[model samples]
Structure formats: structure tokens, C-alpha cells
Target: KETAAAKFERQHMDSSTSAASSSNYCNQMMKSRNLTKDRCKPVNTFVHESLADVQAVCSQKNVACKNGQTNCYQSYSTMSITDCRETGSSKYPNCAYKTTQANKHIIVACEGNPYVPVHFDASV
Candidate 1:
């Protein structure tokens, strides 16, 4: 079975590069990662830092998640990432996304004894 941490990695982690010309990045990435399979994700983010750095976020100080849970942690430093917002025209299977790239701090929720990231709460 796929662990929550693993699914998080698959959904949000991207240690590659990007440029403004890559507006299709979200479309291609989100689709390739299977986020567009069943239905278009309303919104999503992809971190550009290495996996090790992202995982380290789990040990950072706890913060309140959007839902008000206290299991979330804020990244110690601003990170390069891309945000994908589902467009009004987006539909199932052929899901569409509007991309926005930024360098900012991140908030993510973690779980389990190993304490790895499980949910992308927000980017600040």
C-alpha cells in the first residue's frame, strides 16, 4: 500500500527546475503525476527543493493548519515552488490548471512516528 507520506511526495514534491515559459508545467506535471486523472484538483503546489530538505520540514515547529489543526509545520526557509489552480474550464479527465510560480515559505501537515509531511497546507 502507498503510505500517506509517499502520496504526498508524489503529489507535491518536484526537485526539478522551471521557467516562466513553462506555463504548461502545471498541466503537464499535474497530469503526469495523476492529479488530473479522476478530476481536476482545485489547487495544488509543487516544491522545487530536494526531497531531503522537504522532509526536514516535518521536524520544524508546529503551527495551526488551515483547518485549525496543530499538526502542521512551517518550512524554515522560503522555497521555490509552483501553484496550480484549476481553471473555470477544467473538467474531468481533461483537467486544466492555471500555474503560478513563487519562492515562499510553506506550511504542511505531518503524521505518524517518523513525522513526514502528509498535506500541503499553504505557501506563505
Candidate 2:
């Protein structure tokens, strides 16, 4: 079974990505990372920072998730991220995404044996 932390790293981490120069970044990445296999992920985010930095967010201030979950934590500082939103015309197998880059404090839910981020709740 895949650990939540490992899955988070796979779906959201990309330390080498300095910038999303191409609008096709999300489309390419989503498919390449196998996120598009079952269905198009309507909204997803990739953090352009080190794994350590992202993990540190778990120790930051606590916050409430959109669904009122209390496990969410917000980053101490703004971080680079690429937000992938599904295009309006996007259909099942032919999924497409609009990529947008921004600096924001990320919110995530942390859990597990070592206590690492498990879910990307949102960004603010």
C-alpha cells in the first residue's frame, strides 16, 4: 500500500520546477503522473519547493479545512506553486488543464507514523 506521504510527494511535489513556462505543463504533468488515468482531476496543485520545506508545513499554525476538518495546517511563508484547473471543454479521456503559477501559503492535512502531509486541502 502507498503511504499518504508518498502519495502526496508523487501527486504534488516537484522541487526542480522553477517555473511553469508553458500552459501545457499541467496537461503534460497530470497525464505523466498518472493522475489522468481514472478521471481528470478538476483541481490540483504542485509545490515547487523541497520535500523538507513542504513537510515543515505540517508543524506550522493549525487551520480549519474547507470541510471543517481540524487536521489542516498552513505554511509559515508563501511558496511557489502551480495550480491546475480543468478546462471547461475537458472531457474524460481528453482531459485538459489551465496552469497558473502563484505564491501562497499552502494548507494540508497531516497524519501518519512520522506525521507528514497526507492531503493538500487548499492554499491561501
Candidate 3:
């Protein structure tokens, strides 16, 4: 089974995508990363920072997770990220996404003994 940590790495980390410019970046990444499996993930974030920096957010400060879990944290500083939102016309299996890049404080869910980011909550 894929661990939460591993899943986070797959779904969020994208260091080389710093120069994200393609209009289809989200569409290609969402599908290539297998986020399109079963059903499209309506919204997702791709962090354009080092994995270490992203993991550091876990120890930053506590925040309420969307799932109502207390194991969430928000970054202390703005970070480069790409928000991928599904287009209204996007149908499941034919998932399409609109990519928007920005520097913002990100919220993430953390877990496990070593406490690391497990899920991306949002970017604000």
C-alpha cells in the first residue's frame, strides 16, 4: 500500500516545474501522476519547492484541516505553488485542469511519528 508520505511526494512535489508555463501543465501532471484514476481530484496543489522546505511546514504552526483533523499546519512564508482546479466542462475520465501559479502560504495535513506533510489542504 502507498503510504501517506509517499502519496504526498507523488501528488505535490515538483521542484523542476518551477518555470511552469504550459497552459496544460495541470492537465498533463494530473493525468501523468495518476491523480485522474477512478475520479478526478477536483482541486490539487503542486509545490515548486524542495521536499525539505515543504516538510518543514509540518512543524510551523497548527491549523484546522479541511477534514477536521488537528494534524494540520500552515507555512510561515509564501512558497511557489501551482493550484490545479478542474474546469467546469471537465468530465471524469476526461479530466482537465486550469493551472495557476502563485506564491502563497500553504496549508497541509501532517501525520506519523516523524510528522510530515501527508495532504495539501490549501494555499492562501
Candidate 4:
């Protein structure tokens, strides 16, 4: 559905919530973005690149997704990203997260006529 495109933005695109000052970013953003509503998000990654850049990935390398979908694609260039992982002791409605920022190529699954990322696969 088209919503997946929007959801991708909600889940991944961050442009720049500050280059690297969001020490509590994952905790704040995860919840602020409602990813911690009813349950902790086990793992999530946010890219600090333009939405157009990410969507452009859809037109890049076509690869197999983690779920084995051929609709996946990889970014042509590395990107700044933050990895968010739920803390082991975290609980739903009050989920805690640890954030790590790095530059790497991203992988994602894309769909729709406009062809946009629907799911984040991984980064390397």
C-alpha cells in the first residue's frame, strides 16, 4: 500500500535531527514516532539523508531482501545512519533504546509504481 512509503519516512528518514547530538535520540524518537506504543522495537535504523536520496535507492541495486523478496535494493553510496536497538530490560510503553551512528550502505525493500522503500533490510 501507499502507506508503506509514508511509513518508511516515519521509520527511517531523519534528514538531520542534529548531526550527532541526539544522545537520547533513539529513546525520544522511537517513542515520539510511536514505535514504542505497545511494544519495544527490537531494531530500527534511521538515515540522516534526504528522502529523495533514500527513494533513489529504489532505483539502484536490486537485491534479495532479508525476507527473500527480490524487490529489495541497495543504496549506491554510503549514508549517515543511526542504529536503534531496544534495551534488554526495556518494557513496552516505556521502551528504552541504545543508538549508534555510522556511515554505511543501506538495503531496503521497495514497492509501488513510484517505487519507494517499504522495509529496511540492513546496512553494511
Q: Quick one: best TM-score, which candidate?
A: 2
lDDT of each: 0.89, 0.92, 0.92, 0.88
CA RMSD, predictions in order? 1.4, 0.9, 1.2, 1.5
1-124: candidate 3 lDDT, tens digit per residue: 9999999999999988674688899999999899999899999899999999999999998999888998889999999999899998899899999999899999999989788998899898
- Per-model TM-score, in order, reads 0.93, 0.96, 0.93, 0.93
Clashes of each: 0, 0, 0, 0
lDDT of 2 by residue, 53-97 (tens): 999998898999889999899999999999999999899898999
Which digits, one per residue and each the tens of the lDDT, describe model 4 over residues 71-118? 999988999999999888688777988888999999999989888898
Candidate 4: the clashing residue pairs are: none
**In candidate 2, where is summed lDDT lowest over 10 consecutive residues?**
12-21
Q: Which stretches of candidate 3 lie over 4 Å from their true place?
A: none
Off by over 4 Å in 4: none
- Residues 1-124, model 1: lDDT tens digits: 9899999999999887743247798899999898987778889999988988988998986899999999999998999999999898888878888989899999999999788899999999
Location of the lowest summed lDDT over 10 successive residues in candidate 3: 15-24
**Which is better, 3 or 4, measured by lDDT?**
3
